[PDB]
Design a protein around this ligand. Structure first.
Ligand SMILES: *[C@@H]1O[C@H](CO)[C@@H](O)[C@H](O)[C@H]1NC(C)=O
Lengths: 417, 219, 145, 216
C-alpha cells in the first residue's frame, strides 16, 4: 500500500515536441469529404509534453495537474501502462475517477478511495503458463460511497516482454466539459527506437462517463514485474518493464478537421500554431494559394483597469447624526430626510465601531455600489431587551406601539452600546 | 490442482548412512529461467514441520549442511550426507509459486539396528472395570523391530476383529524400541460369556507368532 | 408541499446560501461553509461584525402564507441531438420504409426526405451524419443498426 | 528469533464455526505472506490457502473452496482463520506459515492447533489397574500396565510413580474411535520389585482437571 519502491528516483520533468497529436472527434456527428472548423479543448501542435519513462533506477509516478484536460501518449511493447487515477485530492475526502485494466477488462469506478503513496497493479510467479493475470490490488485500500460503476468487454492482456523496437502506440484524451468526462482512444502499430513517430492519427471515443466531479490532479499507473527467482521487500523490491508515457495539456483551440471519403481525419490545422495555419483557418481551406490575405485584426489589450471618479466630498454629516448630543424618544422618533450630498459608507460599515449591524433585503457590500432615490434616518433610544423588536414583522411595546418596520423594509438597523 | 506422489513410504538408515527420498509431480514445475519450485519440510516428533531446502538446489538458513536436494523435471530426490539421531521424522514435498499448493504423501525415516522379537504380555480386565459394566482385554507387545507387526485376537479359538485398537510409539531415545498394545473392547456380558482369551503376536523375525493366553476363572 | 415539508416552526433539513463572495456560475453547487467577509476585518472563520454565516434555514411553517409556504421546485435540463438517444417519449414506432418520400422521426430528428440504403460507412460511435451544408444527410437506425 | 503462536486446542459442535489466530513475532506481518495447513494422521498434510495481509487476496484448496474465509489484522500482527459449517470430517490439526518476503526461500511454522469437531462433551478418564493373567505365564521379569479409556478431549498424560520411574516405561499415543480416546501404558520391572514394592500409574486430564492414582 504505502511501501515506497527501493530503486525509485526522481527526475526533472523534461519536455519534448508533439507533431500532429491532440486531434479527436468533438462529437459523434459524422462528416466526410469536408473541412470542418470547430473549437474545443485541444493539445496545440508542436507543443511541450512531459518526458517520463519506467526502468528498473527511475520510476515515474508523479502527480500532474489536470486543469481543463490533458492528453496521453505512450510507446509500449508489453503494455506496461496499467491505468490512471483521477481526482481532486486522490483520497477518500472526495470522489475520484479511476480507470484500471487488470488483464481481464477495463474497470471504471467512482467512489471515495484511500490514497496510497505508490498505487499500481502487478503480478508475480507466472511460471509455465504465462498467465500475467492481475494478482495484487494496491490501487486503493478501501472504497465507499460509489455513485458510478462500469465494465467493458472481457479480453486478455499480453504482458510478454519483447525485444526490438516499440511495437505498440497508445494515445488517450481526458477532458471535463461541465462535469461530463469524455474518453478517446487510438491504437496503431509502430516501429520506433526512441521519441515518437512522425505521422498523423485520429482518436475515437471509448466510453461516456456523465459523472460530474471536480478533478484537478491525476496519476499514471504502471505495471511491474515479479518472479520466483528475484523478489524483493514488500513491496519495495519490485521492478517494472521498459516504457515511456507522455502527458500533454489541452487548451480551447480551434482546429480545421479534414474529413476523407470514409469520414476519417487525414489532416489537421491549428490556427494559433502558424500564421499560415491562421490563413487556412480564415479561408476555411487546407490549401493556401500564393498571395496576401487578411486573417484577423490585431489589438493591444488594456494593461489594467483605471477608475477615476469625482471627489466624494460634501458628505452629509452622518457621523454627527450618530454622535448627536441628544436623540428623540422612541415614540417621538425623528424622521430625517437626507439628499443633495454624497454618502461614504466605507467608514461606517467597515469601522467595527458599533456592537451590532444587520441589513434586510440587501447586503451591506452591495449598498456601497448602489444609487438610491430617497434616504431616511430614524434615530431613537430603547432598552436592551427591546432591541430585538426592531425588525420587519415584529411586535411588542416598541414594534407595534412606537416604531414599526414594514415586512418589505429594505433598510438597515444600527445599534451600539 | 496438482497431484504429488512420494516413494518409498519409509526407509531405515543407520547413523552415518545416506537417505534418499523422492517425489513425483503430475505437472512440470521447471520454467524458462532454469530454476525449480519445491520446498522440503520435516516434522519432528511433537513438533511442527520445518523447512529444509528451497529450489531443490539451495539450502535454507540454519539447516545442517548434510541436507541437500537434486533432480530435474518432475522427478527429484532429497539426499542427506550423514543421517544423525535428530533426523527422525516425516519428509514432505511442497509445490510453491502462484498455484494451489500441493503436499506429498510423506516419507518416514528411522535408524537401523539389529532385529529383535516382541515381548508379549496379556492382562485381563480389572475387577473395577467389570463392576462399571465394561471390559477391555489388554495385550502388550514391546521391543520389536521393524515397525511392521500385527496382533490377532481369539476367543475360545474363534477370531474377533471388532474392537481391536493398536497404537505405535515413536522411536525410543536409548534402545530405539517400538512398542504397541492391543486393546479388545468388550462388554461385561460378552467378557463373562467366554472363558479363554489368546493374544498372538505376528512378527517377521519369527515364523510362529508369539502367543500368550489366560483364563477368566483363573484371574 | 406545505403539508409535508413544514414542521412546527421550521425545517432544518432545508437550507439556503444567504451570501457568497461573488456571482455564481451556471450549474455549479457550492457547499463551502466559509464565512462571508463583508468588511475589511478578517473573520477568522467565525461569526462576528461584518461576518455572517452564509448557510441559513428557511422559515417554513404550516401557517405561513402563500408566498412564505414551501414550494418544492424541480428543474429539467437536457441536451437535444448532441449525443446518442438514451431516453425517448412513449410514442409508438412503426416499420421502416425505403425508396419513398416520407416524414421521418428518427431519434428525435423530424423532417422530410427519401430513405435509402447508404453507401457511406459510419464509425461505431457515430450516429448522426451531416452534409456539406450541415443539414440532415444520414442517420443510424436505433433498433436495427 | 521469529515464532508463530497458535491456540493449543479447540472443540466445537458440528455446524458451528472456529476462529483461529496465528500471532506474528519478530517480523512484519504486512510485508510477508501467511499460509495455512491442515494435518490428519491417515494421509498426512492437506493444503488450505494463502493470504497476503498487505493485499488480502486469498486462494483456497478446491476441496475447501466456499468452506472458509481468511482474514488478517495489521495492528495486532496476528493472522486469523475462520471455518464455517463444520462437520465430523473437519477434525484435524491446523498450522500457519509465513515470513516469505515474497520469496520461497524463507518460511516458518507454528506448533499448530488441534481442532476436533464432534458432538461429545468432556469426559473424565476412567483409570483401571492392569494385573497379569493366569499364573501359568512366568518369566525372570514382570510386566505391568495401566488402562485409560472413555476420555475426551485430548491430550491425556499417563506416567508411573509420578514420573520417578523412567525404566522400562512405554507411553502409547491415544487412538480415536466413536468420538472417544483410548491410551494405555506399560512399565517393565524385575521380579524383585513387584509385588515386593508398590507400582502406581498417574493419569492427568488437564481439560477435565482429573487426577487419578491406581495401585496394581
Ligand atoms: C479486475 O477488476 C474487476 C473489477 O470489479 C474485479 O471484479 C476482478 O476481480 C479483477 N480481477 C480480475 C482477474 O478480473
Amino acid at each position: 500500500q504505502c511501501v515506497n519502491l527501493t530503486t525509485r528516483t526522481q527526475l526533472p520533468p523534461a519536455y519534448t515536441n508533439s507533431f500532429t497529436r491532440g486531434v479527436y472527434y468533438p462529437d459523434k456527428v459524422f462528416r466526410s469529404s469536408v473541412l470542418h472548423s470547430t473549437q474545443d479543448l485541444f493539445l496545440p501542435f508542436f507543443s511541450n509534453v512531459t518526458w517520463f519513462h519506467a526502468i528498473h533506477k527511475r520510476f515515474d509516478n508523479p502527480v500532474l495537474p489536470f486543469n481543463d484536460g490533458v492528453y496521453f501518449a505512450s510507446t509500449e511493447k508489453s503494455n506496461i501502462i496499467r491505468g490512471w487515477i483521477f481526482g481532486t485530492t486522490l483520497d477518500s475526502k472526495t470522489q475520484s475517477l479511476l480507470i484500471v485494466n487488470n488483464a481481464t477488462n477495463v474497470v471504471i469506478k467512482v467512489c471515495e478511495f484511500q490514497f496510497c503513496n505508490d498505487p499500481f497493479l502487478g503480478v508475480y510467479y507466472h511460471k509455465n503458463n504465462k498467465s500475467w493475470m492481475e494478482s495484487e490490488f494496491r490501487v486503493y485500500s478501501s472504497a465507499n460511497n460509489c455513485t458510478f460503476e462500469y465494465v467493458s468487454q472481457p479480453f486478455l492482456m499480453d504482458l510478454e516482454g519483447k525485444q526490438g523496437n516499440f511495437k505498440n502506440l497508445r494515445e488517450f484524451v481526458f477532458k471535463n466539459i461541465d462535469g461530463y468526462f469524455k474518453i478517446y482512444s487510438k491504437h496503431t502499430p509502430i516501429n520506433l527506437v526512441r521519441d515518437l513517430p512522425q505521422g498523423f492519427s485520429a482518436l475515437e471515443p471509448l466510453v461516456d462517463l456523465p459523472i460530474g466531479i471536480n478533478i484537478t490532479r491525476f496519476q499514471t499507473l504502471l505495471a511491474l514485474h515479479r518472479s520466483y527467482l528475484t523478489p524483493g521487500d514488500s513491496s519495495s523490491g519490485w521492478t517494472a518493464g521498459a516504457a515511456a508515457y507522455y502527458v500533454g495539456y489541452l487548451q480551447p483551440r480551434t482546429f480545421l478537421l479534414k474529413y476523407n471519403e470514409n469520414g476519417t481525419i487525414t489532416d489537421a490545422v491549428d490556427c494559433a500554431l502558424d500564421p499560415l495555419s491562421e490563413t487556412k483557418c480564415t479561408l476555411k481551406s487546407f490549401t493556401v494559394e500564393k498571395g496576401i490575405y487578411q486573417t484577423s485584426n490585431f489589438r493591444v489589450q488594456p494593461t489594467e483597469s483605471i477608475v477615476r471618479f469625482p471627489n466624494i466630498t460634501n458628505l452629509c454629516p452622518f457621523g454627527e447624526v450618530f454622535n448627536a448630543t441628544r436623540f428623540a424618544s422612541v415614540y417621538a422618533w425623528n424622521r430625517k430626510r437626507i439628499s443633495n450630498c454624497v454618502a461614504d459608507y466605507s467608514v461606517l460599515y467597515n469601522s467595527a465601531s458599533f456592537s451590532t449591524f444587520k441589513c434586510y433585503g440587501v447586503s451591506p457590500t452591495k449598498l456601497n455600489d448602489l444609487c438610491f432615490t430617497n434616504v431616511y434616518a430614524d434615530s431613537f433610544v430603547i432598552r436592551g431587551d427591546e432591541v430585538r423588536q426592531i425588525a420587519p414583522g415584529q411586535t411588542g411595546k416598541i414594534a407595534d406601539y412606537n416604531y414599526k418596520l414594514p415586512d418589505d423594509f429594505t433598510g438597515c438597523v444600527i445599534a451600539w452600546n | 490442482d496438482v497431484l504429488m506422489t512420494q516413494t518409498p513410504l519409509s526407509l531405515p538408515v543407520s547413523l552415518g548412512d545416506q537417505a534418499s527420498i523422492s517425489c513425483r509431480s503430475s505437472q512440470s514445475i521447471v520454467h524458462s529461467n532454469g530454476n525449480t519450485y519445491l520446498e522440503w519440510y520435516l516434522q519432528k516428533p511433537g513438533q511442527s514441520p520445518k523447512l529444509l531446502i528451497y529450489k531443490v538446489s539451495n539450502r535454507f538458513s540454519g539447516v545442517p549442511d548434510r541436507f541437500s536436494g537434486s533432480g530435474s523435471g518432475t522427478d527429484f530426490t532429497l539426499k542427506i550426507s550423514r543421517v544423525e539421531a535428530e533426523d527422525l521424522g516425516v519428509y514432505y514435498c511442497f509445490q510453491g509459486s502462484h498455484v494451489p499448493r500441493t503436499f506429498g504423501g510423506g516419507t518416514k525415516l528411522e535408524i537401523k539396528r539389529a532385529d529383535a522379537a516382541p515381548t508379549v504380555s496379556i492382562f485381563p480386565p480389572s475387577s473395577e472395570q467389570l463392576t462399571s459394566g465394561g471390559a477391555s482385554v489388554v495385550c502388550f507387545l514391546n521391543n520389536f523391530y521393524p515397525k511392521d507387526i500385527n496382533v490377532k485376537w481369539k476367543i475360545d479359538g474363534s477370531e474377533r476383529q471388532n474392537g481391536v485398537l493398536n497404537s505405535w510409539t515413536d522411536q525410543d531415545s536409548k534402545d530405539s524400541t517400538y512398542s504397541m498394545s492391543s486393546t479388545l473392547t468388550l462388554t461385561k456380558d460378552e467378557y463373562e460369556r467366554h472363558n479363554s482369551y489368546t493374544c498372538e503376536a505376528t512378527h517377521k523375525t519369527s515364523t510362529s507368532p508369539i502367543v500368550k493366553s489366560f483364563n477368566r476363572n483363573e484371574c | 408541499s406545505n403539508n409535508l415539508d413544514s414542521k412546527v416552526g421550521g425545517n432544518y433539513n432545508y437550507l439556503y446560501r444567504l451570501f457568497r463572495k461573488s456571482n455564481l456560475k451556471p450549474f455549479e453547487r457550492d457547499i463551502s461553509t466559509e464565512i462571508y467577509q463583508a468588511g475589511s476585518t478578517p473573520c477568522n472563520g467565525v461569526e462576528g461584525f461584518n461576518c455572517y454565516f452564509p448557510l441559513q434555514s428557511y422559515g417554513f411553517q404550516p401557517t405561513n402564507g402563500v408566498g412564505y409556504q414551501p414550494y418544492r421546485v424541480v428543474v429539467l435540463s437536457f441536451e437535444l441531438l448532441h449525443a446518442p438517444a438514451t431516453v425517448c417519449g412513449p410514442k409508438k414506432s412503426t416499420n421502416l420504409v425505403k425508396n419513398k418520400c416520407v416524414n421521418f422521426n428518427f431519434n428525435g430528428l423530424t423532417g422530410t426526405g427519401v430513405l435509402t440504403e447508404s453507401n457511406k460507412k459510419f464509425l461505431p460511435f457515430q450516429q448522426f451524419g451531416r452534409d456539406i451544408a450541415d443539414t440532415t444527410d444520414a442517420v443510424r437506425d436505433p433498433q436495427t443498426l | 528469533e521469529v515464532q508463530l503462536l497458535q491456540s493449543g486446542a479447540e472443540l466445537v459442535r458440528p455446524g458451528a464455526l472456529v476462529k483461529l489466530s496465528c500471532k506474528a513475532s519478530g517480523f512484519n506481518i504486512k510485508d510477508y505472506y501467511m499460509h495455512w495447513v491442515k494435518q490428519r494422521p491417515e494421509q498426512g498434510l492437506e493444503w488450505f490457502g494463502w493470504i497476503d495481509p498487505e493485499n488480502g487476496n486469498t486462494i483456497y484448496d478446491p476441496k475447501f473452496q466456499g468452506k472458509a474465509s481468511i482474514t488478517a489484522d495489521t495492528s495486532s500482527n496476528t493472522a486469523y482463520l475462520q471455518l464455517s459449517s463444520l462437520t465430523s470430517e473437519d477434525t484435524a490439526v491446523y498450522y500457519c506459515a509465513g515470513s516469505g518476503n515474497y520469496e520461497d526461500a524463507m518460511d516458518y511454522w507454528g506448533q499448530g492447533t488441534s481442532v476436533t469437531v464432534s458432538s461429545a462433551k468432556t469426559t473424565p478418564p476412567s483409570v483401571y489397574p492392569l494385573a497379569p493373567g493366569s499364573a501359568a505365564q512366568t518369566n525372570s521379569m514382570v510386566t505391568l500396565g495401566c488402562l485409560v479409556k472413555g476420555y475426551f478431549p485430548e491430550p491425556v498424560t499417563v506416567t508411573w510413580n509420578s514420573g520417578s520411574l523412567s525404566s522400562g516405561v512405554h507411553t502409547f499415543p491415544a487412538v480415536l474411535q466413536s468420538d472417544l480416546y483410548t491410551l494405555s501404558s506399560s512399565v517393565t520391572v524385575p521380579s524383585s520389585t513387584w509385588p515386593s514394592e508398590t507400582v502406581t500409574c498417574n493419569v492427568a486430564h488437564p481439560a477435565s482437571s482429573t487426577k487419578v492414582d491406581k495401585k496394581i
